[PDB]
Amino acid sequence: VTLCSPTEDDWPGMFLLAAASFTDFIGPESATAWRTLVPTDGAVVVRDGSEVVGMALYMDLRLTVPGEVVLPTAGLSFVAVAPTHRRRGLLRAMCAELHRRIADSGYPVAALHASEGGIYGRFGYGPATTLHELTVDRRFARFHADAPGGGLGGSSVRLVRPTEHRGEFEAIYERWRQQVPGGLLRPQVLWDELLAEAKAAPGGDRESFALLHPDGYALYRVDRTDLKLARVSELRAVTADAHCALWRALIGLDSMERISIITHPQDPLPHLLTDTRLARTTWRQDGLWLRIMNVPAALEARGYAHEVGEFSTVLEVSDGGRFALKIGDGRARCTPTDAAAEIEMDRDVLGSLYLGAHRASTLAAANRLRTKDSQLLRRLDAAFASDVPVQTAFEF
Amino acid sequence: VTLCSPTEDDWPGMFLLAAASFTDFIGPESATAWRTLVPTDGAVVVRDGSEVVGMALYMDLRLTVPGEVVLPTAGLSFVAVAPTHRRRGLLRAMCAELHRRIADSGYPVAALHASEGGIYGRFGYGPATTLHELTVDRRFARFHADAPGGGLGGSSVRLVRPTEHRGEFEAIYERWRQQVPGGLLRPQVLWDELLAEAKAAPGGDRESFALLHPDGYALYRVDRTDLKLARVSELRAVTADAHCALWRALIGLDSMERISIITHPQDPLPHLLTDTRLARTTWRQDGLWLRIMNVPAALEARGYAHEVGEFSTVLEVSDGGRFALKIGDGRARCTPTDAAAEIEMDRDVLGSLYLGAHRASTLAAANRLRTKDSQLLRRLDAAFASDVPVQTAFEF
Amino acid sequence: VTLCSPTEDDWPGMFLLAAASFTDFIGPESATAWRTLVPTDGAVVVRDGSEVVGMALYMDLRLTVPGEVVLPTAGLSFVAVAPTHRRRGLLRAMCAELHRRIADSGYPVAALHASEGGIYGRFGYGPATTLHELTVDRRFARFHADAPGGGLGGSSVRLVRPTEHRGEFEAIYERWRQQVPGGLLRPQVLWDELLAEAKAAPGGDRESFALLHPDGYALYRVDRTDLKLARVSELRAVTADAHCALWRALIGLDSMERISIITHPQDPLPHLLTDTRLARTTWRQDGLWLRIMNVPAALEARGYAHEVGEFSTVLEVSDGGRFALKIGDGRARCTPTDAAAEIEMDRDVLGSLYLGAHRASTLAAANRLRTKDSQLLRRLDAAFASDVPVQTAFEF
Amino acid sequence: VTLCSPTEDDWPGMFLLAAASFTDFIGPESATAWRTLVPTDGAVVVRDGSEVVGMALYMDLRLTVPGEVVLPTAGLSFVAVAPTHRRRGLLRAMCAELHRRIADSGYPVAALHASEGGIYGRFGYGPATTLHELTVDRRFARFHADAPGGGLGGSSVRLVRPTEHRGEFEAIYERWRQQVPGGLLRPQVLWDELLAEAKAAPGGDRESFALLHPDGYALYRVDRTDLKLARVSELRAVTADAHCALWRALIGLDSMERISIITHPQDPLPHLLTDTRLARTTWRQDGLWLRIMNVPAALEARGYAHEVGEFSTVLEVSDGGRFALKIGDGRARCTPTDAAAEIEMDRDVLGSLYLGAHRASTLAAANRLRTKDSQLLRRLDAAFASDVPVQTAFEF
Numbered sequence A, B, C, D: 001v002t003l004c005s006p007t008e009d010d011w012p013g014m015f016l017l018a019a020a021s022f023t024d025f026i027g028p029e030s031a032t033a034w035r036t037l038v039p040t041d042g043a044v045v046v047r048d049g050s051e052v053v054g055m056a057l058y059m060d061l062r063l064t065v066p067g068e069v070v071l072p073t074a075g076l077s078f079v080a081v082a083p084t085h086r087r088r089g090l091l092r093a094m095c096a097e098l099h100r101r102i103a104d105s106g107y108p109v110a111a112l113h114a115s116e117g118g119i120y121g122r123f124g125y126g127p128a129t130t131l132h133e134l135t136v137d138r139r140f141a142r143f144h145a146d147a148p149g150g151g152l153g154g155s156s157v158r159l160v161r162p163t164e165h166r167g168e169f170e171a172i173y174e175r176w177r178q179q180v181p182g183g184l185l186r187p188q189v190l191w192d193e194l195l196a197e198a199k200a201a202p203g204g205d206r207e208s209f210a211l212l213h214p215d216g217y218a219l220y221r222v223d224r225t226d227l228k229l230a231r232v233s234e235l236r237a238v239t240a241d242a243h244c245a246l247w248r249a250l251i252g253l254d255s256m257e258r259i260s261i262i263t264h265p266q267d268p269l270p271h272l273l274t275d276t277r278l279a280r281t282t283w284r285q286d287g288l289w290l291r292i293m294n295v296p297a298a299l300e301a302r303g304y305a306h307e308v309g310e311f312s313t314v315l316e317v318s319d320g321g322r323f324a325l326k327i328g329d330g331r332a333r334c335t336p337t338d339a340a341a342e343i344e345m346d347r348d349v350l351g352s353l354y355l356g357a358h359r360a361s362t363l364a365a366a367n368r369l370r371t372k373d374s375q376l377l378r379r380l381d382a383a384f385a386s387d388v389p390v391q392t393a394f395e396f
């Protein structure tokens, strides 16, 4: 039980453990694409004296945070302990080694998608974005008088084969990810992967169609088993016009009873309809999780609300340092101090505040975030809040 | 088809229509209690040349709004058109008459709970609060190290018969409703009603139990059919200690698999657990709906965020007037003007902003709220936002 | 194991066997009402050397058959063999004794409702009417331009308590049963019974409401468990106006998703809607079963289609006699002959033809009805067919 | 938005719209077969200034109507409006153009299968045949003494691979379609298609088997998911012997719990069993829809019941002409008149009467068919009724 960087001879063993550990595993030939995003010394394996009983790696990602600021992000992925080697501290050992490497490489943040909601808090990760399934019963769906693009003349939305409009989707996604907190750069190899899953699989998923606007696209497919349900896999709109136009087109799928989509809590769709209730929230879950690797570097890099006035405090992160935090003009200055702390939180809590998805008041109500001054609580709420609402880019 | 105030001879006819129109109708003897909250000239009936084919009324309510300010509120209820008299403009006629009376009586706002989400927007009502069902699989539920009241010595929470601690529940609810936006004064007759539904019904609901803290209570009962589910009908906590203590007690119901509760989007419960995901959102729906009867009187009466600086604009409400709105020091001054409008919205949209549940940015994204200045949008978002998170009191 | 007419001392034993044999048993106090319809020597019990292990009886009924002709009918009911005395020929013995008594009393027909579809063919009973559940998704239901009573002014349909309009329901049902094949006289005691089941039972069925027209009524209640379903227990309309008006009222139950009713295959409801398919057939089953006790007396008593011309044939019923059958001017003459049979059928098959629900062609295709002349088959089809479509009155 | 006949360059665009509009779409290579049945100028597309946003076509069909008379029939199919171009009158425009072409080509009738039951009435189509799912619990199924082919010696039914007995199936279907109202000529290319779907698909449908009689065949396969259910896709029997023999074989599938089939309301199967109720009606829906293009040409072409005597009337079809209709000797003469109408109906209603599936009395009860003389109603019922019961051939 020694902890090493994998050699090329180790990957077949890692793919075996992946196949047994993740039910959604897309096989080795598809894993070559994602492997391009793993830097040299981005992966750790544990061997038993021999085969692979343990693995974890990070990918080089670019995360957009409030103020349209793009951070280098270590994306944690492909974490797996053999069923034969549980309760043996292999995860603790692997996560520690990667965090060392992530820290020493100069990543201010790491991020992951959690398989369970109870594992990653202890390693410093906080849930930072919220996933939100909306299901529209589109038979009753009528658009409000106030809704855009409900006038005579032509539609701007086209129905198209995804594979023949890759360039337009890239262009739109690139505009989208740069201006939305939670946005991730989607490299070429992940566009290759995304469009290979657009085509119909024998006894698998059905053909994916696209609705294409100058400033938006929606990829959808009819469900395998439920043939009256369209699953919107991905809708990216840069303008409210594009968003609305795309939903007029989706509500126009007259052979479907229900359109479903995984979106964000602030999706304006419910307000496009004469009946808000027709867009039911069927499902809600933690999206992206953040570990703030370097507190001063992260707090300084993001923009803050211009609306709150200048204010200063001392933030203590448990075993992560104490800081004089001065916020004003939507910039922050974060500097070492030994002054008495006014606000205390574990590092995972800072992850949950960092993109604006969670309010400091809420975490304080749970005593995850201690302060004796509620004026300071309101000011943190206001400053950390995001003007553009926070969204989840793509699962990794 | 003439529209009149009911006489005592009209109520049996109204109770007949109620029994046929609402499946949850609690019968005449229980309707005597609610009738005490209907003012003289609070009810309209439509007769056909004869029996009651139409009815609507308002109750005298006291609604808490941001800044711990209590408004007189006309609560719209008991609205029903005979199945024999649909598509005949009886609702339009009845709602118009009540709104006339509500306006001329000096109510700044009316409120209702909607049976459908598509009827009430056209009459000026906006969804103002969000209901949120959390279901905890309590078998996996462990409280976080940071959570309050996890130390040795005694528990402060007692298990009790609801009927023998009415005074303590009243006291706690009275403290709660005065300090929470969406709070409603619960009069004596509704406490009589609430505790009569605490006892077990033959072949109906099971006995209700209470968890009692100095600063909180929870009423729960095991589900009729699912005997591994506890339904928390009502949890009122005044302090974070009370909230946490009550959930330790609820998670301690070792014979249940699932605790469910209808709460608000900012409920801190998910953050009390080591696994946020164990508190699943199973259901989400519009709660209280607001019609702003008098725009200047309502906008002036509520508190605003101290965090946003002083700012002025011209608000047009469609067919509801145009106003110079000046917000600063968490007060608003709202005065008539004929100056060019900077912000336009239908009256229902103002209802949805009024308690802070919905962001102006979100409604703007849906074009329910028109402005050409996004700086003004951020300022409205910030000013209208509620420091204490908005909650739904009781259904009427 | 001797077969006797019950004494008053035998009924408690019969009620015990009834409670164990029929899950829907309405108890002894309610069985006093139905007992009034059992004639002296209408009931047989089997005792074991002692308690009741066997029972069967007939009730005095008046059945309407084609040509608005009302026949005295022995209604077979309350048939039960102890679970302790199966496969012992007690049913065969009891049915034989009752049929003897029914025959010798001068009933031309007996009728029953079957608990199973496989028992009663061998005793000479044929399924004579078809039950047909229609379920309307009333959210999509719009009436056709051509539909009656879709013009301005008042509705003629009232919503009422069943118990306060007994006289009007009786009057309408009495008009209905006299003019519809399958109609049964409903005596006073069965109107007492029907209205006692209109009221809500503690942890049972909900309150029943009535829609009342001068020429029609509908009794409905919301389902116990499914609160979005209205079950129409009974709709009697004498004119197409009444039928349509009542369905406009039922489709107006805006709190229901689905209206369900057990009706007949020729119910015009599907054709009242712009979308026939909205009235789905969810369920279909044999209704009333007929045993022709006296072939000549029954064939002579009913009217025949005036459209088919005069024609003669020889009908053989297996072990039920051979007859010269002459049909013309919608009358039949049925006389003994020893002439060669042109048409053969078991007696149960004649029951199935007798009210016009089943076509002779269909039964011939199944070889239940033998002839070597298809011209004669078409003529039987045409003559036996009912101008007024055949309906099921009430279960007994 | 111009309306044109498609060029060969337009089909890829039509196949894209087909894939997105119909979930059952069988792909382009299979659509080449059906394309052979589309005449020159049988198809219309709508382009947007460019891609295909609209399409509709008719196929050359031969429909059997009562009196074993075969009509040329325009079969409407492949109708689709882009989700991006709803509520724009593209369907109205396309249907109008095709009906013009269908009329001017000399088709007396058009027919279609409806995706929804609410679209096609306004374009003059009436539901003309009824689909009827029977499900047999074959564990309890015993054949009646009277049933054919229940004697000793050999069975005449063989179990066979469909692909090796194509000639025998063709021969039987050809005999069947010529003698049954609703019958359609099945051309070579549709037999190619039918037998390609007989073989097992990887992770799709299972292998199809055939039961083969000299005068009948049944194609069945075990259900994908439910392995105790045999789905009879198609049973064609020319003689009652063949029908019965085939069901003895199907009830002999001792590894199945349930045999299901989509058949017609007059299927004699229920009467083959000792228990009629074992053949439950699980599902019922409109089959083939008819638009009478030329009222006199259609009314004159079909046979009428010989049983009803000679009679004359004036039929008005709304915006379809008024006619002196004289029916006798099972022929009709239909001639222009300006005499007062005795019977009025919309054109769709005539479609519903034309094959005998619906009774004029029933449509009159719904006021779809106005007359002041009920004697004339009985005579129309009798004359339009079909001696051979009406069946649905194959979906298109």
Ligand SMILES: Nc1nc(SCC(=O)NCCN2CCOCC2)nc2sc3c(c12)CCCC3
Residues within 6 Å of the ligand: A022, A024, A025, A026, A030, A031, A032, A034, A035, A038, A057, A077, A078, A079, A113, A395, A396
């Ligand atoms: N990061 C990756 N993601 C995917 S599919 C996107 C997705 O939604 N994953 C959720 C579930 N995961 C499944 C797999 O990783 C853990 C949990 N596929 C591959 S192959 C592969 C990676 C990789 C990492 C780099 C090495 C080889």
Ligand SMILES: Nc1nc(SCC(=O)NCCN2CCOCC2)nc2sc3c(c12)CCCC3
Residues within 6 Å of the ligand: B022, B024, B025, B026, B030, B031, B032, B034, B035, B038, B057, B077, B078, B079, B113, B395, B396
């Ligand atoms: N306002 C009232 N509320 C209740 S129960 C609380 C509740 O949750 N109602 C939701 C459904 N409603 C059911 C009834 O009113 C409409 C929809 N019960 C009565 S009796 C009664 C009222 C009344 C108004 C005053 C007159 C007589």
Ligand SMILES: Nc1nc(SCC(=O)NCCN2CCOCC2)nc2sc3c(c12)CCCC3
Residues within 6 Å of the ligand: C022, C024, C025, C026, C030, C031, C032, C034, C035, C038, C057, C077, C078, C079, C113, C395, C396
């Ligand atoms: N004929 C009767 N009918 C009813 S309820 C109508 C009904 O729907 N019955 C269907 C099921 N049956 C249940 C009971 O009889 C067999 C199957 N209730 C009583 S008490 C009673 C009878 C009687 C006969 C006369 C003697 C005492």
Ligand SMILES: Nc1nc(SCC(=O)NCCN2CCOCC2)nc2sc3c(c12)CCCC3
Residues within 6 Å of the ligand: D022, D024, D025, D026, D030, D031, D032, D034, D035, D038, D057, D077, D078, D079, D113, D395, D396
């Ligand atoms: N007429 C056709 N039918 C079939 S499959 C038989 C079937 O059951 N269709 C029901 C659903 N339809 C699905 C497709 O057409 C609308 C609704 N497949 C093709 S490819 C094709 C046609 C065609 C028309 C000619 C042009 C190309």
Ligand code: NA
Residues within 6 Å of the ligand: A062, A063, A064, A070, A177, A178, A183, A184, A185
């Ligand atoms: Na980015």
Ligand code: NA
Residues within 6 Å of the ligand: A235, A261, A263, A267, A269
């Ligand atoms: Na969206």
Ligand code: NA
Residues within 6 Å of the ligand: A124, A125, A126, A290, A291, A292, A347, A348, A349, A350, A351, A352
């Ligand atoms: Na963190």
Ligand code: NA
Residues within 6 Å of the ligand: B062, B063, B064, B070, B177, B178, B183, B184, B185
């Ligand atoms: Na209050």
Ligand code: NA
Residues within 6 Å of the ligand: B235, B261, B263, B267, B269
């Ligand atoms: Na709570």
Ligand code: NA
Residues within 6 Å of the ligand: B124, B125, B126, B290, B291, B292, B347, B348, B349, B350, B351, B352
């Ligand atoms: Na409002």
Ligand code: NA
Residues within 6 Å of the ligand: C062, C063, C064, C070, C177, C178, C183, C184, C185
């Ligand atoms: Na009668």
Ligand code: NA
Residues within 6 Å of the ligand: C235, C261, C263, C267, C269
């Ligand atoms: Na009916």
Ligand code: NA
Residues within 6 Å of the ligand: C124, C125, C126, C290, C291, C292, C347, C348, C349, C350, C351, C352
């Ligand atoms: Na009989």
Ligand code: NA
Residues within 6 Å of the ligand: D062, D063, D064, D070, D177, D178, D183, D184, D185
């Ligand atoms: Na044909």
Ligand code: NA
Residues within 6 Å of the ligand: D235, D261, D263, D267, D269
């Ligand atoms: Na069949």
Ligand code: NA
Residues within 6 Å of the ligand: D124, D125, D126, D290, D291, D292, D347, D348, D349, D350, D351, D352
């Ligand atoms: Na027609």
